[PDB]
């Protein structure tokens, strides 16, 4: 799996591949790995499909019940709920989660929660099997305060390379753009990103 979130001027952009593998067999080649928990808070899931989907459902429920009582939760609050589940159940879980959200006060924020159940707030995060091949590329190419177009190109080029080298990654590149304007969904097909 190849997934990544990037902080930019307008807000934050999340990207992912669309491949679900069982050994060598691609079970689903057009899976949507970008799941919303709130209107402008999304999560990218890596590790056990069962474990990650189960936790995502619980966090979504917690943020819904939070919203009914206390109003819109912070991206920090959403990341905290994930960490609580992942940390307390670290012996029975295999989940690596990137949380990307947009407040109007905090603007764009990215949090990563690795296997251990620790939390790291970063300008950008990479995770999944494909991420290991683009640590060099992403570190050299990432800038702070990029435009929407620049950030889309950065993620497209990054996940392109990670798909090229990782057998566990492939299919379409789905992206979600979180801004003040709202939520925009983008898809990029092999014929587009392969020739980059």
């Amino acid at each position: 799996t190849t997934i990544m979130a990037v902080e930019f001027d307008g807000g934050v952009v999340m990207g992912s591949d669309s491949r679900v593998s069982a050994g060598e067999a691609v079970v689903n080649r057009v899976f949507d790995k970008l799941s919303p928990l709130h209107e402008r808070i999304y999560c990218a899931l890596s590790g056990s499909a069962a474990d990650t989907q189960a936790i995502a459902d619980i966090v979504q429920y917690h943020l819904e019940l939070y919203t009914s009582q206390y109003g819109t939760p912070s991206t920090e609050t959403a990341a905290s709920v994930f960490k609580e589940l992942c940390y307390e159940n670290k012996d029975n879980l295999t989940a690596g989660i990137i949380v990307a959200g947009y407040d109007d006060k905090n603007k764009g924020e990215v949090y990563t929660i690795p296997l251990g159940g620790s939390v790291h707030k970063l300008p950008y995060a990479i995770a999944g099997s494909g991420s290991t091949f683009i640590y060099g590329y992403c570190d050299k190419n990432f800038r702070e305060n990029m435009s929407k177009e620049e950030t889309v190109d950065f993620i497209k080029h990054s996940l392109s390379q990670a798909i090229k080298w990782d057998g566990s990654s492939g299919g379409v590149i789905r992206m979600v753009v979180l801004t003040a304007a709202g939520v925009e969904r983008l898809i990029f097909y092999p014929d587009e990103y392969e020739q980059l």
């Binding site: 619980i58 979504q60 429920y61 819904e64 019940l65 009914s68 009582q69």
Partner: protein, 241 residues
């Protein structure tokens, strides 16, 4: 005479604790009204801030249960908030377990079942509140479902609750006897709120300022409450015709 203290049958086959819980319902001296449009459900409630030391923004008997469902309460605020918190927990749990938003009438039934238990189990007292649940349901459309301390609930074309409910009920009855339809034949929710306020003024025989009313509006995929300025714009439109 301990058959009057706990929820056991009197020789007449009556539950006095349930009947006295109904009387607690009118302790606030507030009247609420709910009507249905074509695309919307509107609920209006009297707002009384008797103390000048109170923060008037915090004084509310209308609750946002879920994104789709709104709830107005007739009764004391402690029992109102008790019912509000439970309704919010039940709506959230429903979505998690069954993977779709809890319908207005299903929540009404669930809260009514909870109320029924308090009329049968001795250790739990009834809540002295009448809960009016409003939404635009994705299957049934505009929906009004009301619950009471007896554990009774039913769907309504329109409804009124409070000390002067009969005056408001008869007023609404007479209008639907003329129109011969189950709703307010109006496109915009603004004009359905203007109808609701107009018919409460006619029924109670009292004029309202922007701070004397509290309005909740249910549309497709959200319930919201109007600000004082949103109500003022409504009151101006009523006066200008």
């Amino acid at each position: 005479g301990y058959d009057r203290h706990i929820t056991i049958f009197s020789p007449e086959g009556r539950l006095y604790q349930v009947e006295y819980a109904f009387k607690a319902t009118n302790q606030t001296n507030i009247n609420s009204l709910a009507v249905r449009g074509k695309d919307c459900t509107v609920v209006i409630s009297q707002k009384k801030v008797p103390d000048k030391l109170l923060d008037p923004t915090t004084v509310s008997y209308i609750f946002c249960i879920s994104r789709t469902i709104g709830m107005v309460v007739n009764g004391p605020i402690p029992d109102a908030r008790n019912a509000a918190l439970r309704a919010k927990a039940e709506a959230a749990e429903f979505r998690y377990k069954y993977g779709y938003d809890m319908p207005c009438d299903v929540l009404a039934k669930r809260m009514a079942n909870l109320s029924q238990i308090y009329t049968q189990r001795a250790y739990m007292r009834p809540l002295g509140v009448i809960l009016t649940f409003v939404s635009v349901d994705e299957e049934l459309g505009p929906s009004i479902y009301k619950t009471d301390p007896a554990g009774y609930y039913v769907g309504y074309k329109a409804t009124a609750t409070g000390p002067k409910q009969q005056e408001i009920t008869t007023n609404l009855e007479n209008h639907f006897k003329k129109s011969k339809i189950d709703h307010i034949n109006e496109e915009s929710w603004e004009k359905v709120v203007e109808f609701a306020i107009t018919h409460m003024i006619d029924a109670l025989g009292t004029e309202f300022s922007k701070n004397d009313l509290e309005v909740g509006v249910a549309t497709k995929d959200k319930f919201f409450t109007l600000s004082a300025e949103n109500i003022e714009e409504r009151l101006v439109a009523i006066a200008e015709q």
